[PDB]
Ligand binder design. Sequence first.
Ligand SMILES: *[C@@H]1O[C@H](CO)[C@@H](O[C@@H]2O[C@H](CO)[C@@H](O[C@@H]3O[C@H](CO)[C@@H](O)[C@H](O[C@H]4O[C@H](CO)[C@@H](O)[C@H](O)[C@@H]4O)[C@@H]3O)[C@H](O)[C@H]2NC(C)=O)[C@H](O)[C@H]1NC(C)=O
Ligand code: NAG
Lengths: 48, 49
Amino acid sequence: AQALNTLVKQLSSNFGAISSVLNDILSRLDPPEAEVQIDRLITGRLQS
Amino acid sequence: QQFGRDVSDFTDSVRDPKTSEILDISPCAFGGVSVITPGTNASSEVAVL
Ligand SMILES: *[C@@H]1O[C@H](CO)[C@@H](O[C@@H]2O[C@H](CO)[C@@H](O[C@@H]3O[C@H](CO)[C@@H](O)[C@H](O[C@H]4O[C@H](CO)[C@@H](O)[C@H](O)[C@@H]4O)[C@@H]3O)[C@H](O)[C@H]2NC(C)=O)[C@H](O)[C@H]1NC(C)=O
Ligand SMILES: *[C@@H]1O[C@H](CO)[C@@H](O)[C@H](O)[C@H]1NC(C)=O
């Protein structure tokens, strides 16, 4: 349970360091090249 | 209140901006697809779970 609690906390732990929600980085930042930032975000979540 | 969240950071409840209704949000549908076979040599008809 403490492991799964830690896994939930990984989603709140933002990794790419400028975003909080994927909806936000779609809105706040532009589509055609700020998608580099979420790849940074997803790969830490991948390793997590 | 406007809208609530669970133990996680996902929106649990929501309140109607027009009618002020106690609503709550559930995820749509997902899960695993599991295939049961009696083996290709024996038969060729499958069943899913
Ligand atoms: C935002 O605006 C919407 C309207 O666009 C409004 O929703 C309305 O809420 C009221 C009350 O919550 C509803 O009115 C009821 O309607 C039924 C049938 O239409 C009537 O029988 C009801 O009458 C009873 O209550 C009256 C008021 O006390 C009494 O005069 C009467 O004798 C009865 O006791 C009542 O009028 C209405 O159906 C909705 N309409 C819609 C489209 O949803 C909402 O309240 C507004 N919200 C805010 C925050 O302003
Ligand atoms: C396939 O099933 C038949 C049953 O009649 C068996 O004789 C055969 O050896 C099986 N094939 C293999 C590769 O084992």
